[PDB]
Design an enzyme around this catalytic site. Structure first.
Site, PDB file in Angstrom:
ATOM      1  N   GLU A  28      16.848   9.226  23.229  1.00 38.22           N
ATOM      2  CA  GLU A  28      16.745   8.026  24.035  1.00 38.22           C
ATOM      3  C   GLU A  28      15.303   7.850  24.474  1.00 38.22           C
ATOM      4  N   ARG A  29      14.813   6.620  24.379  1.00 39.31           N
ATOM      5  CA  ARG A  29      13.522   6.308  24.963  1.00 39.31           C
ATOM      6  C   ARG A  29      13.539   6.686  26.435  1.00 39.31           C
ATOM      7  N   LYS A  88      19.604  -2.828  19.621  1.00 41.33           N
ATOM      8  CA  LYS A  88      20.544  -1.738  19.852  1.00 41.33           C
ATOM      9  C   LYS A  88      20.579  -1.339  21.321  1.00 41.33           C
TER      10      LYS A  88
END
Lengths: 54, 85, 472, 84, 118, 473
Positions: free
Chosen positions: C183-184, C157
């Site tokens: 979000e990372r 993704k």
């Protein structure tokens, strides 16, 4: 030679499909384990959800 | 489950059929209709009476051809008839 | 006069302010509580009565002394809007996370706002060309649409979104934007870096990208409302600017996860899969809001991280409907080693029709899907007995399908970190022709390992020649 | 009552598993907090007390004998189950 | 008895599974909710009450022993895994070996350990 | 004397929280009364929740009900009339006939819920019923005093077999039949009405015997649940009074269980005695033990356990399947294939089937009939593999005896008139039993493929080829 070869291929129909039968048995045992576990876990999660609602 | 217990039946369009190219994807074996051809123009019925049985036979030979091997005349004829239908 | 409220109770991230006056803060409005470390704005979420309204935190919940004076803005969180947003990566409150100071916005529309009008919805069939093979043939990307890439946990993704960003943005022809939820942190840093480097946002020049980052670190309420803030910025950039705007949402499943975490502490009885009692309704209100009306064009990339890698999860199931061109990527395909990981037998785009990308393209995709479905269908007997035990027609189809699946991956420009090859963008018409040929056996004798991580069938033949030189 | 008379006997707690399920319902209605497998943990307590009832007595009290014939319901061989 | 006579006493336990299961039963009785599978809010502290306080002192030692009959010889129960990790070397008490010539039959065959350093 | 009434205070979900006055707290399961502008609103009290407020999940639509409307107790449980007057009518769950057929005044309108037979009132016997279908005439006897179950999903239409069984039995029944439409699809309800009226079973003006009561599936769940209670009450009255072997058919006990679970969830109770249902035990057992055999006589039941498409996991379905004695399996796949009876003589069973309970010959033939079909099932795989050649002379005889007998297993129905168009068949036990044996015996082994299929008895398989052979000559 043709008689021996027909006998040997009939063996290949009893010594190669035999390996295929073993593979089917192993896969069937694995899949039966997965489905029996999935049904039980689904019922358990259902009971847990119903009680956690209550 | 409740709808399938209350509804008239189903056209259970399984994803494999639509993936198998058959668009529209009525998985005939998995389909069902309680009313049936009695609620149908008989002009359809004269051919559907054979169409249903032919699809049924194709269901009987799907596994046999899945093996991908030879068989008798009835089996091969059934497979060709079902695929064509 | 000023409106002040006293924090009656702070439980988890769902805090309570008992505004003991007449005009209580309106629902879905912003309540500001002055913690010494900032402006912990709150979303007045449920007027629990007795002059008590329960709020969702837009920041940290630690240290809020029961009874802090909470001042009410009154209306929704006024996200700054305008061209000035470009190049600044705003925060969930609209506060400029970029250490470039306040951004001079001519106006600020409400974060929560009415969805597109039912009669203002410019139906379109334009296909946006991204170049990736699965995006090329199996599921076209609708130009000015909402393409959802519902896929497993990082199994492609993030990389797919990044590559699509580096592809579309240069020729975006408008003013795009990036909105993240959960979000990372490293991934967010990398996205900012790539946008800066690609020239998409020019630090001291013109920027076609304005970012709103909602990384997973934040409090649950911030995670939920950050994407709404992004959507408000996007709709403002779509109507007021009236030009194509590409807004991409990363891990929109994280928004639903924020809903789930908040809801239980918010006093809603547990729902399906413990998901928030209002999954679909809220997801629609934050998804149906994003559309390309006649006012302007909206390119929406809403990646959904299907929890438990099983798209049967109720949140992903509700997600699947609201998105147009679905490019599913699942761990099954990834485990085969194909980097693009798209489940070709599953990933479909309703933007793809007979009269959309070409009758030949439609037939090519139909044949390819039929072949791959045949391979999957025969995989059981293949494993149980072997490739020899079945038909030579079936064997030929299986070999062609294996080659096709090995042709599904491609080298993506930013994925060169993993595969190491400089990225390859397969031309849509070229890709369709290549696939039609490969099914038709114009290269069926080329090597299988020379079909993975290459460009079109031309690069495939070049790789086959290279393998003829090296492997021998 | 049979056994302490010193004689022998055989009890058959036929399908004790359903008795356990009845206890589970009784606990749930009586609002005893639910636990693993949603039956009250007291299921094991009641079952142990009902099971350790019978044995062979010593010559000290006359040596009564008693045999148990309980049955259960293997829900797919419910080995990880609590009641089984 | 160990500390009141300085007497190094080895301890034998009925079944760690028995005690942990009983503690789970009681913890369920208390009012805690059921956990993911078959646990409850305080599973570990039950056995952690005793076994974490049986160690070796100067007056001797407290090196207890836990009796385990490997139920179906399957390691899908977390308590049995931690218990088999508790032991140092394994004595394969196969029934045949008891008749093979050893009344004790404690096989040192499964005496595997990396603690044997110089 | 004094009319006890209260103030229906709270309406939540489909349940109305009927508070009451001092000493006016209605008992659980008692019949309440609620008069509404739309007519009568039927509410059955639930767990009496203290505070003088007894809960209730209504048997009619929750709409329109206004808080605080007075509700006066009926002084007892929910009731429907009992007696031969009910015959020919479609009794609703509330009890107000939905056919507009006017009130057929009976002796009593007994309360729905009551006591079951004692162990001194529960008897048992080994009797076989003439089900008129050679499938149930041979491969599985139906019990005159024992439950007779069934299975099969949507499209197998086991209700058709139910109506056919009712008609054939009534055609030689000294006692009146009964039915219970537990939540059937309304259109299927009307079609059942038409087929039952025109078949002569439901003599609109005469003296009918098969009183069909339907739960109608389109109400809040409580009425659907209690409908089977009403039907069991009716059959109990008929057995108690007329004392003849009174049949009993239940439409969809699987739908009954869905309704029970829907009631439990609709009630505040926590459904956990099945994993999704707490009341399943009590209600299902009560309904099943309502079908009881007494020294005075037997009230044979026939419940249809719909198969939720191979729901082997469900504990309630297994309780139902192991809550009976004999059954028939009517599959739509590989069992309706070229069969008007649509049954599977293999997977069927009959616990009452003993050579000393079913007839010495009937067991002798069935043993062969079961084996030959099993051999036909055994030869089902082989014939399609290499061809119909591999069979031996006895085997090919079996393949030519059974594949015609399995085809002969079919039979057009006396009630399935509207669809198929073949006039129905209703041979007897002395007919069908010796019929299948002669098919096995080969005395008519020269018959054509379709000669004994979709036919009547053995003597009726002669004409089928003879009249069809006229086209070839």
């Amino acid at each position: 030679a043709m008689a021996q070869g027909y006998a040997a291929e009939i063996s290949a129909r009893r010594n190669a499909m035999d390996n295929a039968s073993k593979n089917a048995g192993d896969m069937i045992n694995r899949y039966s384990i997965l489905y029996n576990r999935t049904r039980q876990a689904v019922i358990t999660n259902e009971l847990v959800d119903i009680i956690t609602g209550a | 489950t409740n709808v399938i217990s209350i509804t008239d039946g189903q056209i259970f369009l399984e994803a494999e059929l639509f993936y198998k190219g058959i668009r529209p994807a009525i998985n005939v074996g998995l389909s069902v209709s309680r009313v049936g051809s009695a609620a149908q123009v008989k002009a359809l019925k004269q051919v559907a009476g054979s169409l249903k049985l032919f699809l049924a036979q194709y269901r009987e030979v799907a596994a046999f051809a899945q093996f991908g091997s030879d068989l008798d005349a009835s089996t091969k004829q059934t497979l060709v008839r079902g695929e064509r239908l | 006069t000023p409106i002040t409220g006293k924090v009656t109770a702070v439980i988890g991230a769902i805090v309570d302010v008992h505004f003991e006056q007449s005009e209580l803060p309106a629902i879905l409005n912003a309540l500001e509580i002055k913690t010494p470390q900032g402006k912990l704005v709150l979303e007045v979420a449920q007027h629990l009565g007795e002059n008590t309204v329960r709020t969702i935190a837009m920041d940290g919940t630690e240290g809020l002394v029961r009874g802090e004076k909470v001042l009410d803005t009154g209306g929704p969180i006024s996200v700054p809007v305008g061209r000035e947003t470009l190049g600044r990566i705003i925060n969930v409150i609209g506060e400029p996370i970029d250490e470039r100071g306040p951004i001079k916005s001519k106006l600020r529309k409400p974060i929560h706002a009415d969805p597109p009008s039912f009669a203002e919805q410019s139906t379109s069939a334009e296909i946006l060309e991204t170049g990736i093979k699965v995006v090329d043939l199996l599921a076209p990307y609708a130009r000015g649409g909402k393409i959802g890439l519902f896929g497993g946990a990082g199994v492609g993704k993030t990389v797919f979104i990044q590559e699509l960003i580096n592809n579309i943005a240069k020729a975006h022809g408008g003013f795009s934007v990036f909105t993240g939820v959960g979000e990372r942190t490293r991934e967010g840093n990398d996205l900012y870096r790539e946008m800066k480097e690609t020239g998409v946002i020019n630090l001291e020049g013109e920027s076609k990208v304005a970012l709103v980052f909602g990384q997973m670190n934040e409090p649950p309420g911030a995670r939920a409302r950050v994407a709404l803030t992004g959507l408000t910025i996007a709709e403002y950039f779509r109507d007021e600017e009236g030009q194509d705007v590409l807004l991409f949402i990363d891990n929109i499943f994280r928004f639903t996860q924020a809903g789930s975490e908040v809801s239980a502490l918010l006093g809603r009885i547990p729902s399906a899969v413990g998901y928030q009692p209002t999954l679909a309704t809220d997801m629609g209100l934050l998804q149906e809001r994003i559309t390309t009306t006649k006012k302007g064009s909206v390119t929406s990339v809403q990646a959904v991280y299907v929890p438990a890698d099983d798209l049967t999860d109720p949140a992903p199931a509700t997600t699947f409907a609201h998105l147009d061109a679905t490019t599913v990527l699942s761990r099954g395909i990834s485990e085969l080693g194909i980097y693009p990981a798209v489940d070709p037998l599953d990933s479909k785009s309703r933007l793809l029709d007979a009269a959309v990308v070409g009758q030949e393209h439609y037939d090519v995709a139909s044949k390819v899907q039929e072949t791959l479905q045949t391979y999957k269908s025969l995989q059981d007997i293949i494993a149980i007995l072997g490739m020899d035990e079945l038909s030579e027609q079936d064997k030929l189809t299986v070999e062609r399908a294996r080659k096709i699946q090995r042709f599904l991956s491609q080298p993506f420009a930013v994925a060169e970190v993993f595969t190491g090859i400089p990225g390859k963008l397969v031309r849509l018409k070229d890709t369709v022709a290549s696939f039609k040929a490969v099914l038709e056996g114009k290269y069926d004798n080329i090597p299988e390992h020379a079909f993975y991580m290459v460009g079109g069938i031309e690069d495939v033949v070049a790789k086959a020649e290279k393998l003829a030189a090296e492997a021998n | 009552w049979f056994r302490d008379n010193g004689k022998h006997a055989l009890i058959v707690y036929d399908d004790l598993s359903k008795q356990a399920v009845a206890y589970r319902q009784l606990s749930l209605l009586l609002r005893r907090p639910p636990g693993r497998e949603a039956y009250p943990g007291d299921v094991f307590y009641l079952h142990s007390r009902l099971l350790e009832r019978a044995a062979k007595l010593s010559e000290k009290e006359g040596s009564g004998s008693l045999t148990a014939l309980p049955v259960i319901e293997t829900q797919g061989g419910d080995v990880s189950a609590y009641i089984p």
